[PDB]
Design a protein around this ligand. Structure first.
Ligand SMILES: NC(=O)c1ccc[n+]([C@@H]2O[C@H](COP(=O)([O-])OP(=O)(O)OC[C@H]3O[C@@H](n4cnc5c(N)ncnc54)[C@H](OP(=O)(O)O)[C@@H]3O)[C@@H](O)[C@H]2O)c1
Ligand SMILES: NC(=O)c1ccc[n+]([C@@H]2O[C@H](COP(=O)([O-])OP(=O)(O)OC[C@H]3O[C@@H](n4cnc5c(N)ncnc54)[C@H](OP(=O)(O)O)[C@@H]3O)[C@@H](O)[C@H]2O)c1
Ligand SMILES: NC(=O)c1ccc[n+]([C@@H]2O[C@H](COP(=O)([O-])OP(=O)(O)OC[C@H]3O[C@@H](n4cnc5c(N)ncnc54)[C@H](OP(=O)(O)O)[C@@H]3O)[C@@H](O)[C@H]2O)c1
Ligand SMILES: NC(=O)c1ccc[n+]([C@@H]2O[C@H](COP(=O)([O-])OP(=O)(O)OC[C@H]3O[C@@H](n4cnc5c(N)ncnc54)[C@H](OP(=O)(O)O)[C@@H]3O)[C@@H](O)[C@H]2O)c1
Ligand SMILES: C[C@@H]1O[C@H](O)[C@@H](O)[C@H](O)[C@@H]1O
Ligand SMILES: C[C@@H]1O[C@H](O)[C@@H](O)[C@H](O)[C@@H]1O
Ligand SMILES: C[C@@H]1O[C@H](O)[C@@H](O)[C@H](O)[C@@H]1O
Ligand SMILES: C[C@@H]1O[C@H](O)[C@@H](O)[C@H](O)[C@@H]1O
Ligand SMILES: [Cl-]
Ligand SMILES: [Cl-]
Ligand SMILES: [Cl-]
Ligand SMILES: [Cl-]
Ligand SMILES: [Mg+2]
Ligand SMILES: [Mg+2]
Lengths: 258, 258, 258, 258
């Protein structure tokens, strides 16, 4: 299936690790031009693989919590490529800021997750209008299921779903589509670090995997990526405002199944 | 994006008109083998176009309300191709059976819409298990929005969404994925005939189109088809139980927007 | 909170057992007049309790799958009371008709569950229009979660949710509100009979109860009843089309919680 | 229907205007003790009416964006009453902070809306645990429908829905229920101030009212209040994590209906 993304310029925040890395790699495979915005330099093998698929792919160092850095990096992207066709808001961290944490920690979680999705859309939208481009926001099933001890992240992830509907409304007349992908359990460096905070990470991981209805296994980054890239493409040309769950049945199927 | 559907055998009910026709054509383009189950012979140009893309594509005359015909046609498909990789339940008719119609008419609507989705799954599932295949059910936004004067169809369409979740549960350990696509307004022969039941079809059509948030235009059959075929493919290998709205924002965006 | 249901005539199908019985009892407590439609005679102590709260409460023997019986019982209720203010569609049975069962069994499940909800609305709606009355449909979380081996029931329960939206649309100009209540696990005679089909019923029961997030216990019939009766009352005067989940968090909260 | 809220102490933020005022008044009618947290003095006639129903009803001057003020007012409420049985997070403002506004404005909208819902829960939860109390969060249909030009508010309102699920999970073992109410259009001082920003407010108002499916009229503050108070009560003892739409069908019914 031709996605007609050849030579389309797409910013992917957190685009060199986990889900974001898989999105960048799939974009490159489709001959789109992924532009990774991330705070740490990507690994060399990842950069090699990206460039082999699409030699124009690139990386810009950006701490997304710095509004000026987002501003300047979008500007640099336009200066370098002359257009912007997509934005994937993806950087995030399940930071375990619960009800006991207090205001300052809760707000810091909003900064780490929610506020840069807005900032990036704010700077990207004028350019997306020019190309009738698209936005994909990566949320989390915790936006609708909860988890415990993670008010900051949950709030952020739910806000991201609301913003998906709001931006779809706001940008409809410009032909800019805005959608979200909702993963549940995906093995990534983030998941590795999160599970490591538990008393018994090996047992806990096995416990969780056993609860995923389809295959009793975690979703892969490539599975999230392929739905995300489909949503960026004109194959989804009448899909906007939508929240696509790619989760092995985690969110919606009977909790009682084994 | 390679969908890896080459030589996969997929039954498409009502597969030579409107949405179903577009699904068959996209399957053929991807080198899958669509098998059209429908009561009236397809038009010659459609058959030509299907065969040009995939010469093994075929059509079986089936009145889906006849359980024996469904049974025998699935059997014939297995006899002819040796396997079955997908089922698209798609045949349907918005038949305007309201609260005033009475039991017999309501049940007749269930027969025209709901009951053959079950019958087809009943006969197809043993074969889908063998290939770890997939099912897509085509529902309607009326399952969640209502419409008025159409209890029979609405009930059927809502049951189809429930069956999507149920079959996803039932078949999870066999690796058979089951998903639904929810269109709102799509210009097809069905829509042409439905709108013709109104006092002023031209004005009514324009009224409705003006209410679709994205572009103030109807969704195309190709737009429904591309999401449906994506869902049949291993690119959606961890998506099951899901209801994908392809509707230009019809269902979920603020009713007040113009 | 005054519910202003005094002397309001409400038919409750299956209204003398489990959830339906609790609905009738709460209606009687609020001085409404419940009219039980059921095929078997209510327990003497139940009727005694009902009559102590509301001496005009009554029972009509009805097999709901017989259309003429529904017709005649509604006519008789109108002959007796001169009005109808509410309809609670509640009778149902989780009959375990799965994918392997075949057409005849699936349609029989529809008859046992879905079709009489339609028949009852069909016959009651003219009278509810006259009183600006209300409908409550009792569905099941299986409509959205699935369960396995129960296509007939799931389909019916999902159709009942769609019909709730459809009737809310159809009846809006007459001021007739239509809503649904979605239970998950409630201890009733049906649950006792259902759980008895399992190899170890006592253990299966405990296993299911442990998965209910709020309190690790089943919902009570009175809990379902109080939401259902609230929805019948003018305290819910702008609520229509809605599906209220009364399930201790079963449907929506993280499947992983213990 | 006895709600068993007599002498239960409930903080209502913004509890003397619009929806919050109606919630406080209904609480007082049910013999609960509403404690109004608001930055401006309540109207004299409102306080008179409140005190006639519940003479222990009180008001504490609080700017909710000041964390220390939230902290001290909760402490004072506990010093006065010795207990806290409920929290209604209600204060909010649709502040029209869109995509073009920038980071600072977006975060300010979060402060005006989202962040104090967290702060209030943070300070109230220890006390609600002690009484097995309840939380109700007032969100907005814009969380799911969007609106345009209001990213800050939409994000906040969506975060409040996610927080409802998250807190329901976090607090389940303490028997503390957490639910949300979602209004669409309600005539309040906020609505008057919001509609006044439009070029033709009277006409805009009529245009919006005509789009509400049930009765073509706005929902009343009392309608929102009665659902919110039901959710605070033990009549909703197995309802947690839920989002109750009280909107005349605005969110869920066919956008095409007139
Ligand atoms: N993994 C899951 O199971 C799962 C489930 C549901 C939703 N999600 C969502 O999926 C998204 C991606 O998650 P992931 O698991 O793929 O995470 P990941 O492997 O940690 O990748 C995220 C990348 O973003 C970077 N990043 C984070 N914050 C940044 C910032 N403020 N500025 C610049 N770069 C930043 C990270 O860098 P460093 O780590 O080196 O600092 C990392 O390279 C997140 O939004 C998450 O909420 C994940
Ligand atoms: N068009 C829309 O706006 C829209 C919106 C939401 C959902 N949908 C759903 O999309 C699906 C397809 O709709 P469509 O608009 O593409 O309809 P369509 O153009 O009429 O195509 C449906 C085909 O199925 C055939 N068919 C119907 N019932 C049959 C039966 N019992 N046995 C054998 N063949 C049968 C029809 O044949 P004949 O007509 O020649 O008899 C026709 O060829 C339906 O399930 C519908 O509910 C459509
Ligand atoms: N219990 C649960 O956990 C649960 C969960 C989700 C949804 N629900 C739903 O809640 C509703 C009530 O369930 P329940 O557990 O309270 O069941 P219940 O205790 O069996 O009560 C149902 C009553 O309806 C009667 N009935 C059934 N079919 C009838 C018919 N065709 N004609 C006349 N009377 C009929 C039954 O009579 P007989 O049995 O004597 O024949 C019985 O008295 C159902 O719609 C069910 O789907 C229940
Ligand atoms: N009205 C609607 O159509 C509608 C629809 C959907 C959702 N909602 C939601 O319903 C809730 C209540 O809305 P409403 O229409 O009833 O508004 P309202 O009449 O303006 O009442 C809100 C009250 O809260 C106060 N308040 C606001 N921010 C405060 C703060 N930071 N500190 C202390 N007090 C504060 C206001 O005081 P001052 O105004 O005097 O400063 C006012 O008294 C909001 O959360 C809103 O999002 C309303
Ligand atoms: C780190 C991961 O964050 C995700 O959003 C959650 O859905 C997973 O369960 C896990 O906690
Ligand atoms: C014929 C079509 O049926 C579909 O299901 C509906 O969604 C459309 O509005 C139209 O009535
Ligand atoms: C008998 C009961 O039927 C209900 O609908 C289900 O939700 C329960 O799990 C149980 O099977
Ligand atoms: C002021 C009101 O805010 C609410 O949240 C919205 O739902 C209404 O449409 C209106 O804008
Ligand atoms: Cl917590
Ligand atoms: Cl009707
Ligand atoms: Cl089954
Ligand atoms: Cl905007
Ligand atoms: Mg490294
Ligand atoms: Mg023809």
């Amino acid at each position: 299936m031709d996605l007609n993304l050849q030579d389309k310029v797409v910013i992917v925040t957190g685009g060199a690790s986990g889900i974001g890395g898989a999105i960048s790699m799939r974009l490159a495979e489709e001959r789109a031009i992924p532009v990774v915005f991330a705070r740490h330099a990507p690994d060399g093998a990842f950069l090699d693989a990206l460039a082999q698929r699409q030699p124009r792919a690139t990386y810009l160092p950006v701490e997304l919590q710095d509004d000026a850095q987002c501003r300047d990096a979008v500007a640099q992207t336009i200066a370098t490529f002359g257009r912007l066709d997509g934005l994937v808001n993806n950087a995030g961290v399940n930071d375990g800021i619960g009800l006991d944490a207090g205001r300052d920690a809760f707000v810091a979680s909003l900064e780490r997750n929610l506020i840069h999705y807005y900032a990036m859309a704010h700077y990207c939208v004028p350019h997306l209008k020019a190309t009738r481009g698209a936005i994909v926001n990566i949320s989390s099933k915790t936006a609708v299921t909860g988890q415990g001890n993670t008010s900051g992240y949950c709030a952020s992830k739910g806000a991201q779903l609301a913003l998906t509907r709001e931006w779809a409304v706001a940008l409809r007349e410009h032909g800019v589509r805005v959608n979200a992908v909702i993963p549940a359990e995906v093995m990534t460096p983030l998941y590795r670090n999160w599970i490591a905070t538990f008393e018994d990470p090996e047992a806990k991981l096995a416990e969780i995997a056993a609860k995923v209805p389809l295959g009793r296994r975690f979703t892969t980054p490539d599975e999230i990526a392929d739905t995300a890239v489909f949503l960026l493409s004109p194959r989804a040309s009448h899909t906007t405002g939508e929240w696509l769950f790619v989760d092995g049945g985690y969110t919606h199927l009977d909790r009682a199944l084994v």
